[model samples]
Target: TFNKITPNLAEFAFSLYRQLAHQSNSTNILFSPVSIAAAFAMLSLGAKGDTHDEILEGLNFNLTEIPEAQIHEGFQELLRTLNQSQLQLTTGNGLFLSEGLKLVDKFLEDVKKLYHSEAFTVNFGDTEEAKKQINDYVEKGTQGKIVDLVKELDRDTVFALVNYIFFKGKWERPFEVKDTEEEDFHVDQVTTVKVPMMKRLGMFNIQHSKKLSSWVLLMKYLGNATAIFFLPDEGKLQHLENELTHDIITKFLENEDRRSASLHLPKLSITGTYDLKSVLGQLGITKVFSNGADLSGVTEEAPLKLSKAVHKAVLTIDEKGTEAAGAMFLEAIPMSIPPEVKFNKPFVFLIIEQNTKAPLFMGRVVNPTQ
Candidate 1:
């Protein structure tokens, strides 16, 4: 039942990607939809009446189709399942309460039990200290050093919710250093740059989407995860972008066939920061950030509303591996010349959990140099 949340979550992820694509003209697009959705779901815990509906619906979940309590329960099971897996992914929430504010006891219990969130008391009046406290919490949560996540905050802020999701997966068939070499990558119609392209000849699950005018490739990690790359045909990125959906991606995965191929992927590291307040506003989630917000469920001591909502995501891919790895096996079919599948153009990528099929990270690599 908890797995049911993924379909709509994927829908919300794709919708959010479209919004980011339309909102920005930059070449890079990166964000963790699961992390953002979990944050909003936790926020919904402290929301009441219309505010609650807006948060859930804004994430593409329908209330009439599924009960609210069941939604929370779904998240509870989902978190538990992900935590028990061997995948190197971490996602949780943190609530920083102003020293002057008093929160509802039930809200604390619900968030801790369902979202696995931790609460801390901090003085927002001292903006710098509060920023350090939040960043420290995020750094420890992610098990990686990250600074300046909270660039600014209102002095009068009574409550702050921070959600962080991090993943570090190693390739099952790790790329050798000798196989990496400089190659041309087409950033745009007329912009081409040299990038370190990692080459490998391996068995891959591949599909060609005529509907999207794109080629889909799937790569495996050490554990229960896979990276899906979508490469659009020449001058057909816009068409593929406009037509892509969860259903189409599902079809690609279902119909993919294991075939021998020569693959080329550029080593990538990209980051994206988002002003979630403005982004959510465009998604019909305006009440939570407005003055007349109904966050009465969070605290009764003072009027509560969200002042700042920010999300920062980082992605790194390289020839790294943990102890856990997959064994190499080849099909017993007759050997022939393998087809070359190179990602030399701007392509979209997704790192997803194979069990729940949830996307841990998603982005497009237009200019890896950035």
Candidate 2:
């Protein structure tokens, strides 16, 4: 049920994040690659022939290396492990099938078992109302943190996949609520703004990257997750970004030094939306979104092409700790701070599974108040 490939999912997770980060600078961003990739894993279950090949390869999985059946089981292993904690974490997946498009029984069974996806039949002929219905369900699933996730739908959009994850993990040592105060958050060399900064003094793992000219700090939640941040020293934010590699992060986590830090992280409450179609294309995940793509595993009666891949994520970090929610849609077939280090300037952060090392959500907070 588990092996190296499961951990390798972390590699794919970090790869997609860095690819997207290249297009992003000086902004508040957040997304769940686990949510997106898990959704695609479900989509791939319904993919056949070259379509299946492309989706698997796009997610950075090689069928020869790990085999296909084990891939889903690996996801199952990861999901089961993550939900085992008492962190108030909820992850749900769904396949919104257009009315009358019958899904295969084995596929549905596999999805429900491995991914927890519920199949919903809707009238794609009336796209707007159908989109609204899908969005309403997703909004509720994400605790209202994500709304209007399915804003539009192509008329041929017979099957759209949606997945959402919501987490509210209390700090093992909760911050004093009254200690929150307004402080200056530097936007860049030229500008700064006031943010409600939360204060805490806690023991945390830290890595001082003299090479990147940055500092890395990891903040722990009461559960099996940690939020790690990378703060580039002034004038090196862009330069250090190139050094943001898989081995670099792997070593950072493995070799971090523990210390009691004077942590001053802004009470961050922000939401972000991403056009993942474009982002995935940058990662060579294109054919599935094109017309000639083969998603015959979903249904043989109709033409299925991914028309949209959208992601919406929101997070709140306060004295109580961290709460985050993300929702992603495949509208056919497709698809921070440092420590001791204070997060007072532009920085990158990740919400990672401590055990499997899969990145659940990641972003760069240039302006949390934005």
Candidate 3:
């Protein structure tokens, strides 16, 4: 039943992507929807009444169809599957509570058991120390990929709920370093810049979707994960964004097959930090940020409500993989040229788990130089 939750997570991912794209049309976005969604689900353990309802609904879960208990169980299974040792992927949760502030025993027990979260007590008054402690946990949790996650912290804060995901996997068909060259990447109609583009020619799972007006390429990682890229036809970025849905992604995975092509991709290092309070508000989740919040299960010692919800993520891709295909085969050449697929323009991408179809990281790279 864990796979049952994947569609909802994908739906929420695309919705959040659209919201972020609308707020700032030009900047690059790279956030882990699964990480942010789990943070909220962990917080729901302490939420009461409308506060609890809005959080789950905003996550695209229909309570009328799926019961509350099943939702948490689904996350438990999802997290367990993702943390397995088969892949170099890790995701977990953390809670930083103000010194002397106590949480309900039941809430603490559930968070630890269900979300695999750890708790720490710190003196928020010492802002520098508080920041360092939180950052240290995050940095280690993400295998040193993400650093200084908590830039600013409020002294009056009672608690902070955090979720982090770090992934590092090599391509199944790695691009040879010698094949990389400097090329121009069109940022838009008027802007263009030179970037190092990595190239490979082989049988790749790719297809052209008329519905989205884009070409889709599925690049497999060493493990049970794949990076899906959407390269829109010239000036069709908006059309692809408007038409993409969870069903289409699932169908693409089912129907797409491999074909010989020359693929080109740039080295990528993308990061995103989000003020979730503002973003969630647009999705009808405002009570948690306002005085009307009802988080009675978190603690009865003080009038506690969420002050801020922040999420950050980082993704990297290069010419690394489990092993090189062969040495002699590359030095020789093919008789004819295959279809060329170059990512020299703005495009969207998603790193997803194959079986569950869970999106680990999602973003749009308008300019790879950034």
Candidate 4:
């Protein structure tokens, strides 16, 4: 029998892994593939119905005969689940047989299987035509926020999937729009960017850490979880990574102390997308791409492998609150903190489940409220 896992729990594991992976690579000043894969895994836990399988199959589609028609169906089903302002998926086949729609077909299948769900597939082409179709779909889905989903596509392209998950919700205690103003955001001692900062003066679980060199601010999401932002001292962004380990994260969640303090967060929007092969390599997930990897549960004969992983993430904050979107592509290969001289430079942030040490998501913002 298949073991049932709660989506929330899976999400928690994904988050925890992301935090650990990010912390491990924080000083490198580059993105981590393992961390992105972990974040994508967490986001996958939020997927319901057919989309989960589609993602799994996309990640596991190496050296397989994937059907284009099936791929098309799965792609459509998965897009439907995102509820994004727009969504677009593109697939290309090269250096193989059958126009090789199978790569993406298998990729989507693996994603679905990970969630113990049925997979969906879609077929476009291995040319500019496919790219245009995907772009159109994304534009429609995102209501123009995402105009171009597949900037470029070709048979040589291993795999490509683009998605947008937009959430517009009010804070438990809303911020007054009139109170927002431009504030100086220091990236380093020498650099400072002006950003619109939102001030919310209320009772929040806040802590000041002289040891970590930043202020820890917590905000609950419907009371089930909280988003923790570590505003570090100027030029001390690197120090938080050392303090943000898996063990420390576990303890942070278990700590029952809650204090009353005011919260000041940047009223900014940011978009980040990068590759993760090197970063994940640093996190000890080398098996997934190596011969020693075990993905037999995804298929009966082990006819597939993970070829690549890609991730795209975006976050926006305003008077209402915060909304963010992140998408990860595991093509078979694949895949911080604070202080406070003023947090004028870069900083680390995390989304954690209050009840568990699990990290739901983590990211480094060189500039917040930008």
Q: Tell me the tens digit of each residue's lDDT in model 2 across 194-225.
A: 99988866556776789878888776776787
TM-score of each: 0.93, 0.88, 0.93, 0.58
Off by over 4 Å in 4: 1-125, 134-144, 157-169, 255-260, 276-308, 322-345, 353-357
Stretches of candidate 2 above 4 Å error? 1-3, 255-257, 322-340
Per-model C-alpha lDDT, please? 0.79, 0.73, 0.81, 0.44
lDDT of 4 by residue, 128-221 (tens): 7656655565566546655554454445443334433333323444556777778787665676778877765544556777878777666655
Q: What is the lDDT of residue 231 in candidate 1?
A: 90
> Root-mean-square deviation of each candidate, in angstroms?
2.1, 8.2, 2.5, 12.1
> For candidate 3, lDDT tens digit of each residue in 1-370?
1277888899889889999888765788888878888888888888899999999999999988988888888788777777665467777678787777667889889888888778778887887888888899988887787788877776667677666766667886678889989988998888889998999888788888899999999988877788999999988998988898888888877765677788899987777877788788898778877777788898876777777567777677888844545334332335777788999999998988876788888899998767
Rank the candidate models, highest lDDT first: 3, 1, 2, 4
Q: Please state the error at residue 178 of candidate 4 in Å.
A: 2.0
Q: How many clashes in candidate 1?
A: 0
Task: Supply every candidate's count of residue pairs whose N, Cα or C atoms clash at under 3 angstroms.
Answer: 0, 0, 0, 58
* lDDT digits (tens) for residues 134-159 of candidate 1: 88888887776455677778877766
